[PDB]
Short mmCIF file of C-alpha atoms and ligand atoms in Angstrom, two decimals:
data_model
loop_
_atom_site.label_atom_id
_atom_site.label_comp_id
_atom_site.label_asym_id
_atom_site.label_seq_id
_atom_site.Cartn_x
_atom_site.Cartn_y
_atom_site.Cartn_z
CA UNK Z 1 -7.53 49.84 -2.01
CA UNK Z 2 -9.17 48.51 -4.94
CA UNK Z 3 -13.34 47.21 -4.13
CA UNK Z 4 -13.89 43.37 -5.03
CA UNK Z 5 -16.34 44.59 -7.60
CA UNK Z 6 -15.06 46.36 -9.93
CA UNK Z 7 -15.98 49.85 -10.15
CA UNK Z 8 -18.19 51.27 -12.83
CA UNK Z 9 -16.56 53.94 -14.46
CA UNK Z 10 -14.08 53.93 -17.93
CA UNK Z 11 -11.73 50.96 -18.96
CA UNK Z 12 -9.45 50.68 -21.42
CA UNK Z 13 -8.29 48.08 -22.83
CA UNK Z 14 -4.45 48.74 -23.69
CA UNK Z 15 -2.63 48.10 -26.90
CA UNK Z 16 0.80 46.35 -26.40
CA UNK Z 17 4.60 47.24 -27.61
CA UNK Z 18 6.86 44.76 -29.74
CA UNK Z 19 10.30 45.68 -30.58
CA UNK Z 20 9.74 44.74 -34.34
CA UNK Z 21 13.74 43.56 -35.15
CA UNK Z 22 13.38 41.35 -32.66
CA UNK Z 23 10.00 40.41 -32.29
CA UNK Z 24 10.14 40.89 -27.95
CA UNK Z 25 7.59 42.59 -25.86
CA UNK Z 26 8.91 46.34 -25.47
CA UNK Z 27 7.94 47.04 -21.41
CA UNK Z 28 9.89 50.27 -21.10
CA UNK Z 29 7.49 51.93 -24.01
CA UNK Z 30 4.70 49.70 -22.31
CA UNK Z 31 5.08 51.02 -19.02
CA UNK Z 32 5.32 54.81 -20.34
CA UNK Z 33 2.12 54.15 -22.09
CA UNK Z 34 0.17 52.62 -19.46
CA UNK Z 35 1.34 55.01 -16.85
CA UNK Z 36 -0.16 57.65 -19.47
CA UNK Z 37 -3.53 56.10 -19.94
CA UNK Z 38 -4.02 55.71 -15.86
CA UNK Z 39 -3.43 59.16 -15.31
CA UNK Z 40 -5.68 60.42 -18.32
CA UNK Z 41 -9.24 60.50 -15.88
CA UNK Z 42 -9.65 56.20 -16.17
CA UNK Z 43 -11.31 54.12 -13.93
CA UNK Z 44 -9.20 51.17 -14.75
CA UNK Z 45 -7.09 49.26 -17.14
CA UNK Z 46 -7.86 46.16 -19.20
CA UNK Z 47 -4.61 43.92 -19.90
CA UNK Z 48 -4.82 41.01 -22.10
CA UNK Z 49 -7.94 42.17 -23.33
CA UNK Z 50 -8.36 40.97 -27.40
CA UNK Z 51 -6.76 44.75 -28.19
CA UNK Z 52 -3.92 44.00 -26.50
CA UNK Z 53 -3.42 40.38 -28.72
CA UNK Z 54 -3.25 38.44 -26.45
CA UNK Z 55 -3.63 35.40 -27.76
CA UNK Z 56 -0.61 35.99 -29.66
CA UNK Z 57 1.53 35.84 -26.48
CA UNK Z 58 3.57 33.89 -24.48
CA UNK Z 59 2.20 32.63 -20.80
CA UNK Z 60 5.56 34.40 -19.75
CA UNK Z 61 4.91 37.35 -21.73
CA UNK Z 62 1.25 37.61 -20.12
CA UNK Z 63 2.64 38.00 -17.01
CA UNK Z 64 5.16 40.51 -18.04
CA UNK Z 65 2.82 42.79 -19.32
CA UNK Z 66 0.37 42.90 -15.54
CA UNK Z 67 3.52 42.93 -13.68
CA UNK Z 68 4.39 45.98 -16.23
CA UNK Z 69 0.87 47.19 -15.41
CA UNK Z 70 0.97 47.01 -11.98
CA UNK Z 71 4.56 48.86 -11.29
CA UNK Z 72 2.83 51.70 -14.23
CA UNK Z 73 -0.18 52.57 -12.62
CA UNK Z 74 0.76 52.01 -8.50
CA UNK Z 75 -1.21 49.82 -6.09
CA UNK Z 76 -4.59 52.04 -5.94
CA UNK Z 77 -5.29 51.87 -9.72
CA UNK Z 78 -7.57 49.00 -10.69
CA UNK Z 79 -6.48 46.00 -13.37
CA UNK Z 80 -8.54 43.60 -14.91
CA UNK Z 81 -6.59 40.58 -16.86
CA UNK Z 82 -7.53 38.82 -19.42
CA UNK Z 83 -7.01 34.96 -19.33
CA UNK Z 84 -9.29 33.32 -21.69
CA UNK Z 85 -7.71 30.14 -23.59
CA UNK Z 86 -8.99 26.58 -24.28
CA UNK Z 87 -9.15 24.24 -21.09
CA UNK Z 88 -9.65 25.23 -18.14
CA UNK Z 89 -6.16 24.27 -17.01
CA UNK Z 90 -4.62 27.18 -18.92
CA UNK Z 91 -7.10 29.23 -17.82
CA UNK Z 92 -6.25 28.78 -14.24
CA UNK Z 93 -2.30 29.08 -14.76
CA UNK Z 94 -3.08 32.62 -16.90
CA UNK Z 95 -5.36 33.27 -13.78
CA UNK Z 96 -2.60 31.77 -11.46
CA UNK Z 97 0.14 33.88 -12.82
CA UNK Z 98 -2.27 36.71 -12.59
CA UNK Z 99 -2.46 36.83 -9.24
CA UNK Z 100 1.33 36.86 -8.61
CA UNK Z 101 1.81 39.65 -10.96
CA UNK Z 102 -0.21 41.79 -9.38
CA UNK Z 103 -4.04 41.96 -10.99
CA UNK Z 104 -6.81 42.97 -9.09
CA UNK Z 105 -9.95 41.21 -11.36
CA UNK Z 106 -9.65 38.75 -14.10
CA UNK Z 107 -11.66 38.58 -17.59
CA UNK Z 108 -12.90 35.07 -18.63
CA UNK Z 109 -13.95 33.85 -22.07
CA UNK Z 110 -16.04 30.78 -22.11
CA UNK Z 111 -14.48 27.73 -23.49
CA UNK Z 112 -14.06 27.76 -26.83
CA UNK Z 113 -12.23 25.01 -28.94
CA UNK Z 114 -19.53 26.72 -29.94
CA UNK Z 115 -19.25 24.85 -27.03
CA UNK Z 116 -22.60 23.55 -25.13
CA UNK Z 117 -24.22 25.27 -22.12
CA UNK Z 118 -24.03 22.43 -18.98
CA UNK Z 119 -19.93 23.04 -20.06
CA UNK Z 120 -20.07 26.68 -20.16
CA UNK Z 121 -21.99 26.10 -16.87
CA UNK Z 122 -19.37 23.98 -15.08
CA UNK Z 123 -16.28 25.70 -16.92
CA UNK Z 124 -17.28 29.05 -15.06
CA UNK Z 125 -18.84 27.30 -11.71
CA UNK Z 126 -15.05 25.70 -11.62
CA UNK Z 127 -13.16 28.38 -12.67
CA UNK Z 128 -14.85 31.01 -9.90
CA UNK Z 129 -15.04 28.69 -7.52
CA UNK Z 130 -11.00 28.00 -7.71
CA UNK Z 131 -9.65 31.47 -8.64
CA UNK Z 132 -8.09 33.26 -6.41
CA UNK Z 133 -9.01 36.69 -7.90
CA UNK Z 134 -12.73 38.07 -8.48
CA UNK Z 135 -13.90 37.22 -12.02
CA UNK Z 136 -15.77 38.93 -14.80
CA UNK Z 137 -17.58 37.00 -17.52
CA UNK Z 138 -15.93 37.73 -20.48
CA UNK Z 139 -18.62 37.43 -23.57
CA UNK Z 140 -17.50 37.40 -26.95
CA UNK Z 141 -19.16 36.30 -29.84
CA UNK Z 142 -17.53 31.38 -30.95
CA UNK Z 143 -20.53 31.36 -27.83
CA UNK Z 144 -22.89 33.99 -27.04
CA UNK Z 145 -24.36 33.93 -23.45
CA UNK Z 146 -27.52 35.08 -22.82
CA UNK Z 147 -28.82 36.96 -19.80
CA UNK Z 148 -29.91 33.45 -18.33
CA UNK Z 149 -26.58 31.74 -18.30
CA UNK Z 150 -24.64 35.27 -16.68
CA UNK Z 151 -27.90 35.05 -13.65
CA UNK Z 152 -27.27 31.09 -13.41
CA UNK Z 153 -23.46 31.51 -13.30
CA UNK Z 154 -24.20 35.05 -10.77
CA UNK Z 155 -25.94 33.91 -8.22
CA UNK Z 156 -24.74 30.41 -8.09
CA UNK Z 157 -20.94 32.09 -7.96
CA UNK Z 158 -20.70 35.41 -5.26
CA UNK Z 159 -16.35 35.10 -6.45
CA UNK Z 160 -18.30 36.22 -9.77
CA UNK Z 161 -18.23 40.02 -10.34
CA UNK Z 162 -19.18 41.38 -13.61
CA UNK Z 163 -19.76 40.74 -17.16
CA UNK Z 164 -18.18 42.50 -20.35
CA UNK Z 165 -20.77 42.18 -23.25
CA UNK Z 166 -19.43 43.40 -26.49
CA UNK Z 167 -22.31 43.97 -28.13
CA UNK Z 168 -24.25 45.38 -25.39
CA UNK Z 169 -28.65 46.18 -25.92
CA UNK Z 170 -30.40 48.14 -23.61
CA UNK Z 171 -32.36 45.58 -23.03
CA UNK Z 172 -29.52 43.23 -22.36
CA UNK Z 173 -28.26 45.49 -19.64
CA UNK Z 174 -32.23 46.46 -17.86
CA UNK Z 175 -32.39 42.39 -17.48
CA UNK Z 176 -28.82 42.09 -15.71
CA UNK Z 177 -30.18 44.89 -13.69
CA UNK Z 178 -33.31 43.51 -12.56
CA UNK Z 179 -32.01 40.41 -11.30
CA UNK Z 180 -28.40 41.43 -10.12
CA UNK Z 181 -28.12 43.94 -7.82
CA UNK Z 182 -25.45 46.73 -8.75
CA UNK Z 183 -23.01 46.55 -5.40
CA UNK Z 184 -22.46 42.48 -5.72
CA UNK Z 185 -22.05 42.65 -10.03
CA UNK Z 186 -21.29 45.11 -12.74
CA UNK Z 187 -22.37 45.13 -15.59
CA UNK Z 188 -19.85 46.81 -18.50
CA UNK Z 189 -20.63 47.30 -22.50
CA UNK Z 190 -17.79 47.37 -24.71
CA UNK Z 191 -18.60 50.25 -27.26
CA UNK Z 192 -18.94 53.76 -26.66
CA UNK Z 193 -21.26 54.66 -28.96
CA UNK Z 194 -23.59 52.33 -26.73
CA UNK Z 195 -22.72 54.20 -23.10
CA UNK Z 196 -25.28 57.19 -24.05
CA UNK Z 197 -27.92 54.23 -23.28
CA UNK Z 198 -25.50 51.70 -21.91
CA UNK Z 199 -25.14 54.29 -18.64
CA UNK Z 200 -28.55 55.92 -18.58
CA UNK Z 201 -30.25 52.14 -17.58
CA UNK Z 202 -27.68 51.80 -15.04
CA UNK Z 203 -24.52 50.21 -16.84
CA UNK Z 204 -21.06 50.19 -14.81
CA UNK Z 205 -20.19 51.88 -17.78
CA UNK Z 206 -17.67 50.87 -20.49
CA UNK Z 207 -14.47 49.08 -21.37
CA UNK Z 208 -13.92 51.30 -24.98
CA UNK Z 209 -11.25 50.14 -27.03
CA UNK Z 210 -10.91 54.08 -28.23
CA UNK Z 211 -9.91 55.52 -25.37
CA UNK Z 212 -6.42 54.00 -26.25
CA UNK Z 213 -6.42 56.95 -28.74
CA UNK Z 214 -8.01 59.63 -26.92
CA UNK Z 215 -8.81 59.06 -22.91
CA UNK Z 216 -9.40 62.14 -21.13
CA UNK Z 217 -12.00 62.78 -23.91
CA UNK Z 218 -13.45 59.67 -23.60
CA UNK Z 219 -13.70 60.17 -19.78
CA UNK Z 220 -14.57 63.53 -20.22
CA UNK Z 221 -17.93 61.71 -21.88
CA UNK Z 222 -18.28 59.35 -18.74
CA UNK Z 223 -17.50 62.52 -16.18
CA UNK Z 224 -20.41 64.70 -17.98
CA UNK Z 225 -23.14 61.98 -18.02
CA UNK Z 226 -22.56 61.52 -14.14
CA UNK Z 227 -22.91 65.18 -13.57
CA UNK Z 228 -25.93 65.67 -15.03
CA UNK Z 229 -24.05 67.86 -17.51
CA UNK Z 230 -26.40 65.64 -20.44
CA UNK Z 231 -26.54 68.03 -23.39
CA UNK Z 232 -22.61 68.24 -23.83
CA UNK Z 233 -22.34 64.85 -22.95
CA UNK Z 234 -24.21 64.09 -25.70
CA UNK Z 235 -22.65 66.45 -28.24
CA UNK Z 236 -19.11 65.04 -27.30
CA UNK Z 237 -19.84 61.79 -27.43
CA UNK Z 238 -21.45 62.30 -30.93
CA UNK Z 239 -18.05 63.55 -32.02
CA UNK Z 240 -16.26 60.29 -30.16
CA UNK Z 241 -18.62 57.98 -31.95
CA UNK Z 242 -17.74 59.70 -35.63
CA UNK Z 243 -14.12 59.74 -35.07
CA UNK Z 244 -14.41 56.10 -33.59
CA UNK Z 245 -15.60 54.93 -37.11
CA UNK Z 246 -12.37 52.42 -38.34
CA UNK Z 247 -12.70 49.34 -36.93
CA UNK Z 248 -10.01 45.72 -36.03
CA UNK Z 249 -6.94 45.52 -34.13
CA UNK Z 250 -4.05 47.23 -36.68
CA UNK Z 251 -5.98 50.53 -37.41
CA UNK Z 252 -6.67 50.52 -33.40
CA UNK Z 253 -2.58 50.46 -32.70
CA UNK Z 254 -1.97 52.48 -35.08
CA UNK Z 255 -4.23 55.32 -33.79
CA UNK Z 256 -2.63 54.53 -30.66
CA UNK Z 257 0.61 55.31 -32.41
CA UNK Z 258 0.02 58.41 -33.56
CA UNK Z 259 -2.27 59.87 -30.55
CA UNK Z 260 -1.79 58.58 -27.43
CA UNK Z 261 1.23 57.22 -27.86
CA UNK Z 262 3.24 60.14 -29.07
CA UNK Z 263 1.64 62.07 -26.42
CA UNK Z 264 2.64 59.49 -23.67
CA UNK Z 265 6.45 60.78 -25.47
CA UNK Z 266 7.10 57.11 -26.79
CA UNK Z 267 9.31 57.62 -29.70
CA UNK Z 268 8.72 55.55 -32.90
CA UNK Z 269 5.19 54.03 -31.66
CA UNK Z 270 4.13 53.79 -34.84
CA UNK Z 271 6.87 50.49 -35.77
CA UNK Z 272 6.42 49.30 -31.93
CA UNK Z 273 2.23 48.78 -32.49
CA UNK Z 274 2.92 47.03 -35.62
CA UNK Z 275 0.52 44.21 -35.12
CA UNK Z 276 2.54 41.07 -34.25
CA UNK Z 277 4.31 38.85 -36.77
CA UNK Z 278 3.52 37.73 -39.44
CA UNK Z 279 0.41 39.82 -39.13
CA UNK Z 280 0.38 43.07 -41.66
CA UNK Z 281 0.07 46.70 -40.55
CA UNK Z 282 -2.61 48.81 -41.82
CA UNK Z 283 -3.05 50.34 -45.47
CA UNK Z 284 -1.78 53.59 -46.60
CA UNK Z 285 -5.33 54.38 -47.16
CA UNK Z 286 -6.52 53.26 -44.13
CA UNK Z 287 -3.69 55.50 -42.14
CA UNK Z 288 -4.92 58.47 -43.98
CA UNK Z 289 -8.03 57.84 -43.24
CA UNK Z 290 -6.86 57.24 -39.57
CA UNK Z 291 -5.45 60.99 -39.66
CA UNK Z 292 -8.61 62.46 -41.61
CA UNK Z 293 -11.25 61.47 -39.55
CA UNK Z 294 -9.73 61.73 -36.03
CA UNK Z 295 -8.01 65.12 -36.60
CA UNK Z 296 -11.35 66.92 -34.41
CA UNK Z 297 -11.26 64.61 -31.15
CA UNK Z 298 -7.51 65.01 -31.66
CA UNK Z 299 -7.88 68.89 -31.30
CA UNK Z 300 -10.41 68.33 -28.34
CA UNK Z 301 -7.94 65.97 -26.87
CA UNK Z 302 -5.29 68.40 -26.71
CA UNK Z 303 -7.68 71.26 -25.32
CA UNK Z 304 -8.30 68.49 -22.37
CA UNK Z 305 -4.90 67.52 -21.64
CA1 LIG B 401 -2.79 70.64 -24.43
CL1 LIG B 402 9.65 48.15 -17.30
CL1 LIG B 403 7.60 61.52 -29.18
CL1 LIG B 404 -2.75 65.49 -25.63
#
């Protein structure tokens, strides 16, 4: 069964489907593609994450897409939802819904509609305190909390369980540490090319947006470091953070398209992680340079998997 803190370990935060003609979630491609990514050596997945747009989505369509989760990776595989929005009312439908469909942990933004701090305060004191799942502080900078706020909103909340911080420090992560003790809250960075420190201060490790494109590489990293196994740790992850290099949300897809995805045997990935209407796909040049730079982790990936 899955812990009520969520595991340290590798998350990914998955890209999501449309059928372009018609402009519809496609779950059957979804679920192929999830399925893929749980079995590639992750500790969990991260749906509704910002990679997987979901702010573009219907509340119906959220719900679709755990529920798609969920039957994809089995009951024993962890899920974290996202369900940031404005008021605190949709937040606790998206949370309400998540719960139903089958999510183990859910990811909170703070309200945004730069808010002040006694709100972000009682926003997250309400929302814990009334959500039937475990939540994770969600912080993306729009707000930026410091390590204060996360130890206020901790220890006054035990239904709090983690924190994603985007733009992790080391010295962000030693502070969480020092006042929040690892088997009650986990602490996760969201970039890769911070887990080489973000880990070796005692991170829960990493929710990496690029290990849509190449996982059992990117958990290969992870599964190094926590054998001790530093030195090609190191040198692997060096490669990871040089091939990670293009970055927002269209050149991520369309890595995804090209990788993952046609290795998860989804045909025509590359039109179904078009970005959502009427947003553009990437440039030409950015594809090539897609295809350029990530050709070595691509040849690693396939010597993994
Ligand atoms: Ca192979
Ligand atoms: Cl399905
Ligand atoms: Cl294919
Ligand atoms: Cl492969």
């Amino acid at each position: 069964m899955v812990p009520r803190v969520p595991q340290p370990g590798i998350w990914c935060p998955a890209v999501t489907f449309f059928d372009s003609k018609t402009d519809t979630l496609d779950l059957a491609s979804q679920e192929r593609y999830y399925a893929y990514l749980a079995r590639s050596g992750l500790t969990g997945l991260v749906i509704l994450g910002t990679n997987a747009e979901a702010f573009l989505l219907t509340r119906e369509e959220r719900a679709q897409l755990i529920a798609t989760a969920r039957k994809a990776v089995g009951p024993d595989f962890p899920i974290m939802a996202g369900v940031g929005a404005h008021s605190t009312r949709q937040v606790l439908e998206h949370i309400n819904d998540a719960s139903v469909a089958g999510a183990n942990y859910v990811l909170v933004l703070p309200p945004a509609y730069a808010t002040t701090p006694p709100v972000i305060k009682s926003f997250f004191d309400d929302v814990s305190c009334q959500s039937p799942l475990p939540v994770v502080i969600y912080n993306f900078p729009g707000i930026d909390l410091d390590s204060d706020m996360i130890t206020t909103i901790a220890r006054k909340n035990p239904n709090v369980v983690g924190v994603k911080l985007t733009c992790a420090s080391v010295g962000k992560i030693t502070r969480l540490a020092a006042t929040l003790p690892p088997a009650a809250f986990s602490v996760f960075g969201g970039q890769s090319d911070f887990l080489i420190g973000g880990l070796s201060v005692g991170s829960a490790g990493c929710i990496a947006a690029f290990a849509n494109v190449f996982p059992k590489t990117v958990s290969k990293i992870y599964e190094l470091y926590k054998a001790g196994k530093v030195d090609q740790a190191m040198e692997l992850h060096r490669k990871a953070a040089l091939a990670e290099s293009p970055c927002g949300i269209a050149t991520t897809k369309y890595a995804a398209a090209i990788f993952s995805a046609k290795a998860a045997g989804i045909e025509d990935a590359e039109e179904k992680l078009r970005p959502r209407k009427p947003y553009d796909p990437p440039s030409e040049a950015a594809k090539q340079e897609v295809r350029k730079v990530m050709a070595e982790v691509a040849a690693i990936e396939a010597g993994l998997s």
